[model samples]
Target: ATAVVRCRTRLARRVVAAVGPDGLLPAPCESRVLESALALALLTEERAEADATARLTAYLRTTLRTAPPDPFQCAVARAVLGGRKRLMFRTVLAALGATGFPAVPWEAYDTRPQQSWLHMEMKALKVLAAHGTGHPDVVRDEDWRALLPALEPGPAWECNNLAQLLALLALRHSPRHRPALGDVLKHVAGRLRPDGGMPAIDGMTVFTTAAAGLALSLLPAPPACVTPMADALALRRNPDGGYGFHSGVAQSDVEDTCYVLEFLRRAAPDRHRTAVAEAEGYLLALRNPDGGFPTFARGTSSEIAMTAAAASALAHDPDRREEVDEAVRYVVRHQRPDGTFNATNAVFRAVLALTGVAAHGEERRSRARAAERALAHLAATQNGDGGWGHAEAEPSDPISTAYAVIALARGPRARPGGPLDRALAYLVERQHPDGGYRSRPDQAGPRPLLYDVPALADVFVLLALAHAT
Candidate 1:
């Protein structure tokens, strides 16, 4: 728990320092989630420190009331506030309903319960059941019971997953479940450092290798790192011609599929034809009727990130020209008035899709027009500090800024004394003497899992810097 406190405090300091004199941080989900988590951390630890707790509580009451975060974070923030209100219950119920239970977990929209989601659901159920609004029967039912046996901690029992589960089980207070939870706690306790923080996941080898290798290929002479990274990526290719985050993972999604495809084409064009062609086909099949694609199978609604990636992945296929054009249109249509897509990294992906459209050379006017609107949006949405945020009016973070820089550097509109120039300056100022970049603590959520993978940060910086050169 001390490690959790230290982690949140460090994050809170970073966020507090980043806010402008106006006492705002871009008014986005990421910022609000960070603020709420920080407040929760402070209030939880500063129980004897009443004045400190009061101030943090007031911040949460005032700032978050108007623009709350998503369902998961909203429930968390509400729980932190400790109210007997309907909001937390309603949010949790809505989230659970939206993500169906007892379904098989797949690559895209996982219907099956993951440990994080399952634990959160249990926490929510506990909160409601304690208040008499929800039933304990849901906990005892066969459906929920089926999920618990497999929820045991794995070899890669990082603090992120274990800590969250521990918090949930503590809330639950179920003796039957305590033993499994104890195992997780024991695993977490072993990892706790003297300084009260565990080390983050070391450079995500396969994911980083593919990303870094692709970034390096943009340089005049690709670095030696590219060779080993490319080999690593190739070695991880699944029998089905897809790649997971690491070697031998059964699942494959649109993100890594596109990353591997882009890397292979640039790094070893002549080799890996079977792998390349299989991945392209895989992406092609995932396209939705709305002219977009999902992360896995075709879904009711299309995601801009998947759409943009699919467009870029399938961009060079002459036979798929019509489909790719429609995808570019989908990306163009989804751009928010402020210029970002819904997801944090959607703008970066959008830029890639639009640029691919423009580079394709057919339907020149339409593609160029779409690319122009997106580029203009990117320019308009950059923060006053010259870095881009995950969403509009948000404080700049290194990862989002890096994506924006890479996109602009490749776009036709990047010129002298422009948004791109200011963005480049922002990256340079934020660089460390150790050649590392600072990444904001973002999450791939349902739980507060940290997304500050150092290798991902390095790759984005390398891409932006390489393109700048």
Candidate 2:
């Protein structure tokens, strides 16, 4: 019992520092929401954002342990508010333009044992949307439009609520009705720290901000009026001088910081210098005894994603010569005999070659070949219907298709007439008559306006075009 208690204490301390890695000196009460979001994103794995399916799957393996503060609640965050927020919106309506509702634990059980009207109403609304879209008719009644207000940036309940709301509205309402969506986006971006830090809920905001940023970039708004968030991200610089999910939260993780840096540089070029410098520092520090970069900081486990993120980040920097060769060699070290690099995200491996991070010499040749094989695997695995999403065999989704396309095009092996061309064709074929991608096959509910999915499509298209040219 004493040994178990010691282990528990050690784990608790790690959790606390993990959540608030920046060791912030406390902020004004108004900033609590943002701080909590930062902490949750940084600290507990149960509370991290995005990949809800995977997060829950891992949690269930541990004897059905219930997370503290309802870990599920903590993982769901408000993207616009910059806080450790919870999610609202029901998954039943996903068939309706809103693929996945803004909620985490996407398949969570209703804690309320009593039959709740809210759940029933959401079910009915989803059915109505599905019927309209020519899918299973689950809903027969309920003014879906009237219920969309929940999508507005409410406290924690709003999560990705807007995506479903927008997808539903698009089915019936005009784009002009959402004229203020531009304003809504700007409002959310404005809440970001000047350094590009979004106070994400466990790095989930990486996807959230990307979705929101795409929306803001497309909506009619002057470039200057849009404040740059890259600066706010600069504030989160760790003792290792690296960026992560949120300030005073992350422990200078490689993938987390790498994502933040790259995203910020794209959104605001001025922040690139600082982001790149700190990222370089963090990546260099992660060098293992074998010279390969690892996931987190020094003295931590190494992985393919870390090496990829480090290599990619350095490639983006004007000073590529500083770490290019080392990063390339590190990636080559992790290669499997099957010509594939051992990494988490397929995009990371592909992006390395796409950016020319592995250009030239033996190391570059090896990494490039590996990336090509990965792309080929991705292309071959695409569904007969042209859409690719989830982890293959799970389902085909617009977002996954976008990621695959961008990864393929950006990778070094892509040619104008290669598999990427087929992907582009796939994407074009999948576009809905309403001028956007549908959430998924079974998601036929009240029309939804997935502002994020469309934005995702646009971002991927832009990336593909940029690389293709």
| Number of the predicted model whose lDDT against the real structure is largest | 1
- Poorest stretch of ten by lDDT in candidate 1: 101-110
Candidate 2 wrongly placed segments (more than 4 Å): 1-203, 206-227, 263-272, 316-322, 342-344, 347-355, 411-418, 429-469
lDDT for 436 (candidate 2): 41
Model 1 lDDT per residue over 1-469, tens place:
3322233233323333433343222221122333334334433532323444455466556645765545655555555665212333343433333322222111212133333333444443443333333334434333335335324564322223323432333333455654565454344334322322223321244555566667667766664445455665776677666665544344566788888888788877666776778888878777888899876555636888889988988886688888888888888778776555623367678877776654445556655665566667888787888887766777898788877776776676546568887887777677665555677655353333344454456566666666555
Model 1 lDDT, full chain set: 0.56
Q: Candidate 1: lDDT of 417?
A: 66
- lDDT, candidate 1, at 200: 34
User: Which window of 10 residues has the lowest lDDT sum in candidate 2?
Assistant: 442-451
Q: Please estimate how well model 2 matches the true structure, expressed as its whole-model Cα lDDT.
A: 0.43
In terms of TM-score, the best-performing candidate is 1
Stretches of candidate 1 off by over 4 Å are: 1-134, 149-153, 156-184, 193-204, 237-241, 246-250, 336-344, 358-362, 383-385, 447-450
**Error at 220, model 1, angstroms:** 1.4
How big is the positional error of residue 247 in model 2, measured in Å on the Cα after superposition? 5.6
